[PDB]
């Protein structure tokens, strides 16, 4: 709820912090409404190069527990 305040929006975490003092299922249809309105901002389309090269970048390590892999 501080990552949502640096992004500029201030009327959404006031709704959540007014629900955290309740923690009740009667007002949870409001919290499911906030989560569902988030996906209506549009798709996150980006370039084909920056979507692969940020996905196909990973850090492997030879110090992994090999005792757990021979059971896996």
């Amino acid at each position: 709820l501080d990552n949502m305040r640096k992004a500029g929006l201030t009327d959404i975490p006031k709704m959540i912090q007014d629900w955290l003092v309740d923690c009740s299922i009667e007002k949870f249809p409001l919290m499911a409404k906030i989560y569902s309105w988030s996906f209506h901002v549009g798709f996150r389309k980006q370039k084909m190069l920056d979507a692969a090269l940020d996905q196909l970048k990973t850090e492997y390590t030879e110090d992994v527990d090999d005792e757990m892999y021979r059971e896996y």
Binding site: Y60, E62, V64, D66, Y69, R70
Partner: protein, 49 residues
């Protein structure tokens, strides 16, 4: 990039249909563990003969 090598402990398993019979052993030379060698000899004085 560097993929870490992972060799699991295994061995090959054959069915009973293809197990090769024991290839028979016949020897080519004799079993030798001793060999004659040329050595100098010294008499009772110590002088070389």
């Amino acid at each position: 990039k560097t993929i870490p090598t992972f060799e699991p402990k295994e061995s090959i398993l054959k069915k009973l249909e293809d197990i090769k019979p024991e290839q028979v052993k016949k020897q080519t030379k004799l079993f030798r563990i001793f060999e004659p060698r040329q050595l100098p000899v010294y008499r009772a004085n110590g002088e070389k003969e």
